[PDB]
């Protein structure tokens, strides 16, 4: 049970950690293309 | 660009006018604005598409023999190309994919209308 509420809970972050990225993923993806234009 | 060469002081530049002799490029700072209105219509550039697309470019089966032959010619180009695998180039790996891959979409959609 115990130390996880301490520990385990801190992994919700690591969930978001993914969730930070695939967002930013499309960024570079698009940031590519409109930039892929001018180059 | 836009020049207008002189200032009040500045955004307030300040000296060269009061100290005289202002000769410079001196841009202003550009922007512009329109709307989503035209934007949509502007994105409307590219009856219409139905007349214009599938079905207008159903023109595909006519040349299948060439569409073969194209692919058939895609063939030879490659062992040749691959061969070099054994800088300067005509790269062994390059066109190979590129060569065929284009066809695919039309090669694909050839089906669709039915």
């Amino acid at each position: 049970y115990f130390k996880l509420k301490k520990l385990e809970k801190e992994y919700e972050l690591l969930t978001l950690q993914e969730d930070y990225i695939k967002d930013e993923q499309r960024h570079l993806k698009r940031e590519l293309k409109r930039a892929q234009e001018e180059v | 660009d836009a020049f207008r060469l002189i200032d009040t002081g500045a955004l307030i530049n300040i000296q060269a006018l009061i100290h005289g002799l202002n000769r410079h490029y001196y841009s202003l700072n550009i922007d512009y604005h329109k709307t989503a209105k035209e934007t949509k219509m502007l994105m409307n550039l590219h009856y219409e598409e139905k007349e214009e697309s599938n079905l207008a470019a159903t023109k595909s089966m006519v040349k299948i023999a060439e569409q073969y032959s194209k692919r058939i010619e895609e063939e030879k180009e490659l062992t040749e190309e691959e061969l070099k695998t054994r800088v300067g180039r005509q790269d062994p790996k390059k066109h190979l994919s590129e060569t065929a891959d284009e066809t695919l979409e039309n090669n694909i959609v050839s089906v669709l209308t039915a």
Binding site: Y1, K5, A35 | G9, I14
Partner: protein
């Protein structure tokens, strides 16, 4: 053996047999369920035979098969069906499994139950079997008697019945300090965790109540708790209980818990309350906090470490960009003088003023209130020669005092403010002189400055005309102060207005600052502004999208809303306009405040990007998140950005670093030397811009703000709590190369490192160096580990939030705190145990005038 007979015995009659089938089966299920897995259809029907009693055998048997089939809500259900065949103390991994399996089900159920009702758990809707077994394990958790074990469950279990009893029972049990701490352990946790604050807010009240049981509980706990609840009654209950418990230091320290935490809006309730409650005026006098301003200034005036020579070297480095560089150094001087009240360089170059420009002339006047910030009398007289009616050389200089005034008086200048607002209101419906408009604007600036957080419709209103008066000069400030006034949940009508005026009013800036005001009066509203957020998001115009993030920030700042962040990201991801993204990136570190942690890892993407603005917006938020914190790790990410070809980028990076780097310097952080010199390097460099040197000189002056002896603090673990005023200067400074005469707002988060005796009484200021060794960073700082050993010198100066807490008091002197070195330099207050005796007497400029 193999189940074929038991497979056969199944359909065979004589429920006796079926029992002995099931019996024998049950024992050998474990292996042979595999064969038996095909008999489950009958077994199902078997569990549907009330005729055959034991079928709970088969049910749990099926549950055995179902784990062995990976079926669980199946298994659980039939284990639930068992109740007899099943027991918790029955030990198999399976049993342990199915239980743990069965358990989790409860949580979302309970949470879904929690969704609608928060007394859901008081009711039947969850299968009680689980709930029982749940609580039975919670009982076992109680018998485990490590209760976060139980709590974090009941945390999600949302069962205060469990929780409170678990506390209350344990309360009388043992752990005098722990039963307090166990709460805090969970309470501090609860703050970090619970989605619905109500469940947590429920904790907070009971927590207080648990603590209000009081074998003298820790109040700053309750303070923050209260400050988290902002429930005056509790504090008032405290105050009574306080007055019941009354001791100066107790009250004082409580009021010191209070003066450092409760919002300008919240606390003033308690003021009139405490007024109405009867009181000790010391409390009302602590409500000043001017003692701090004094002490801070006292600290400053004493402990200011200046070296304007290098700033002179930075100022003598150039006057250039006409103003726009000369502009900056008009500020860093203010930093080193912030609250310090000195004109040093101001006198040095009087031709400075010549080299100032109407706005810089304006700004140079606004450069004062910084310098004098915390002089709650002089500053007006300081501004007096430059006040309106004292004339000026420039109307903007004349306008400058107006804004410059409130800098000291923010929240305390309302009278003069409203007074000046009268001058505003005077010129509000008229007077389109730019000179006036500044005199309007500079006033339109300083108005909401002091009016910030205080709800005054006039502030909103009077500006709303000055706003609607459509002076890009003037109307801008309105778009701020109006936000500042109603900064809070504000009102959606102004929002409509603003948002209307946004789309309505035609201007870049006037339209711009609106969303900022929108960002303001949407503060902590979170879910609320999402509409306008969505509206702002849906805006064609950057500006609404722009402030949307800031709106989203002030809503969700501090605690990360992933979705918000996720939005903000994707927004920054999905917007053409870079500044928005830049902004959107910037505002992240607000909703990303509470964890600076991943922010480097966060920006480590945006660190690396084609675009400067992206790479620009990076610098701030991270530079913001760790501003009051560490992570050269975080820092070092930006040093490449400090070399990003755009000076404006590195300029930001310059800033961003120093925002972190104050007090952190000198082989604690060796890098500061370069970073400093980099400025100087740049400051030396002619091929570096007045972008570059700007931030450089400023970021220098940043590090040197408040005689370099002061810090930058937000959501201060000192209070554990936010202060919006800390934020403001940032968001204010946000648009600066946009609108330059701003950053002086940044004076807000300036924070004392002061360590000064004070008293648990009216203060003889006995100053002692309490001497507990830190690895010594009062030795690590600009020129011009814990060894539990006596530290050299503990009185004021550098300290550190940490180097605070490697230092503990001597009990030997007359005065001792109850909170036993509460641990926060700025809060000081050695509590007074032995007055009118030795531990002598020490005074200050307060003691002089105040």
């Amino acid at each position: 053996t193999t189940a074929a007979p038991l497979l056969a015995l199944l359909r065979e009659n004589q429920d006796s047999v079926k029992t002995y089938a099931l019996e024998s089966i049950n024992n050998v299920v474990d292996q042979l369920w595999s064969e038996i897995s095909n008999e489950l259809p009958d077994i199902e029907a078997l569990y549907d035979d009330d005729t055959f009693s034991d079928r709970e055998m088969a049910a749990l048997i099926a549950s055995k098969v179902y784990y062995n089939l990976g079926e669980y809500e199946s298994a659980v259900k039939y284990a639930l069906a068992a109740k007899d065949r099943f027991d918790i103390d029955e030990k198999s991994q399976f049993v342990e499994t199915i239980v743990s399996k069965s358990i989790e089900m409860y949580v979302q159920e309970a949470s879904k139950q929690y969704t609608k009702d928060e007394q859901f758990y008081t009711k039947d809707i969850i299968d009680p079997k689980l709930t029982s077994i749940f609580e039975r394990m919670i009982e076992k958790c109680l018998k485990a008697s490590e209760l976060k074990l139980a709590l974090g469950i009941a945390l999600e279990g949302y069962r205060l019945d469990i929780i409170e009893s678990a506390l209350k029972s344990k309360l009388d049990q043992d752990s005098t300090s722990e039963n307090v701490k166990i709460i805090n352990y969970l309470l501090t946790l609860a703050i970090t965790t619970v989605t619905n604050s109500k469940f947590r807010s429920s904790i907070l009240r009971k927590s207080f109540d648990f603590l209000m049981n009081m074998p003298n509980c820790d109040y700053l706990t309750l303070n923050k708790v209260v400050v988290n609840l902002n429930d005056a009654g509790l504090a008032l209950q405290l105050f009574k209980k306080l007055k019941e418990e009354n001791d100066e230091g107790l009250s004082a320290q409580i009021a010191f818990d209070l003066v450092s935490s409760a919002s300008q809006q919240l606390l003033e309730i308690l003021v009139t309350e405490l007024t109405a409650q009867g009181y000790d005026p010391a409390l009302l006098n602590i409500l000043s906090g001017l003692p701090t301003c004094d002490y801070y200034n006292t600290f400053l005036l004493n402990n200011k470490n200046i070296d304007i020579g290098l700033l002179n070297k930075s100022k003598s480095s150039l006057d250039g960009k006409f103003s726009l560089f000369h502009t900056a150094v008009s500020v860093a001087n203010g930093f080193m003088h912030a609250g310090t009240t000195d004109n040093s360089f101001i006198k040095a170059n009087l031709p400075w003023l010549g080299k100032a420009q109407n706005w810089a002339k304006f700004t140079a006047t606004a450069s004062l209130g910084v310098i004098h910030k915390g002089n709650l009398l002089e500053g007006k007289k300081v501004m007096a020669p430059y006040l309106p009616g004292s004339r000026a050389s420039s109307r903007f200089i004349k306008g400058g005092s107006l804004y410059g005034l409130g800098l000291i008086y923010a929240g305390f200048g309302r009278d003069t403010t409203d007074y000046l607002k009268n001058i505003i209101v005077e010129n509000s419906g008229t007077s389109g002189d730019e000179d006036v408009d500044v005199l309007l604007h500079g006033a339109s600036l300083g108005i909401g400055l002091a009016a910030m957080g205080s709800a005054n419709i006039e502030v909103y209103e009077a500006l709303k005309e000055v706003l609607y008066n459509d002076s890009a000069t003037s109307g801008e400030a309105a778009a701020l102060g109006m936000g500042l006034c109603m900064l809070g949940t504000g009102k959606p009508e102004a929002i409509h207005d603003m948002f209307t005026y946004s789309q309505e009013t035609q201007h870049g800036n006037i339209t711009r600052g609106l969303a900022v005001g929108l960002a303001l009066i949407n503060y902590g509203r979170q879910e609320l502004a999402d509409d306008l957020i969505t509206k702002m998001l849906a805006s064609d115009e950057s500006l609404l999208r722009y402030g949307g993030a800031f709106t989203i920030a002030l809503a969700y700042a501090g605690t990360g809303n992933n979705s918000a962040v996720k939005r903000l990201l994707h927004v920054a991801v999905s917007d053409s306009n870079d500044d928005v993204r830049r902004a959107a990136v910037i505002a992240l570190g607000f909703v990303l405040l509470r964890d600076y942690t991943t922010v480097p890892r966060i920006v480590q993407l945006l660190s690396k990007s084609h675009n400067a603005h992206v790479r620009c917006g990076t610098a701030f938020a991270l530079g913001i998140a760790c501003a009051g914190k560490g992570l050269q790790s975080a820092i070092d990410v930006l040093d490449p950005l400090t070399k990003d070809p755009v000076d404006f980028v590195r300029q930001a990076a310059m800033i961003a670093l120093s925002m972190i780097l104050i007090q952190q310097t000198e082989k604690l952080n060796p890098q500061v030397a370069d970073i400093n010199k980099n400025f100087l390097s740049v400051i030396t460099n002619k091929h570096q811009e007045g972008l570059a040197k700007f931030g450089a000189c400023v970021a220098q002056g940043i590090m040197n703000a408040g005689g370099r002896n002061v810090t930058i603090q937000l959501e201060n673990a000192d209070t554990g709590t936010l202060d919006t005023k800390s934020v403001v200067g940032l968001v204010m400074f946000s648009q600066f190369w946009y609108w330059f005469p701003l950053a002086h707002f940044l004076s807000l988060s300036f924070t004392p490192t002061t360590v000064i005796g004070i008293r648990g009484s009216d203060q003889a200021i006995p100053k002692f160096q309490m001497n507990c060794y830190a690895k010594e960073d009062a030795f690590s700082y600009p020129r011009m580990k814990y060894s539990s050993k006596p530290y050299k010198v503990d009185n004021m100066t550098r300290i550190l939030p940490q180097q605070s807490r490697y230092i503990s008091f001597i009990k030997d002197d007359r005065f001792v705190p109850v909170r036993k070195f509460k641990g926060n330099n700025g809060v000081v207050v050695l509590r007074d145990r032995e007055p009118k005796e030795p531990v002598a007497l020490i005074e200050t400029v307060r003691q002089m005038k105040d």
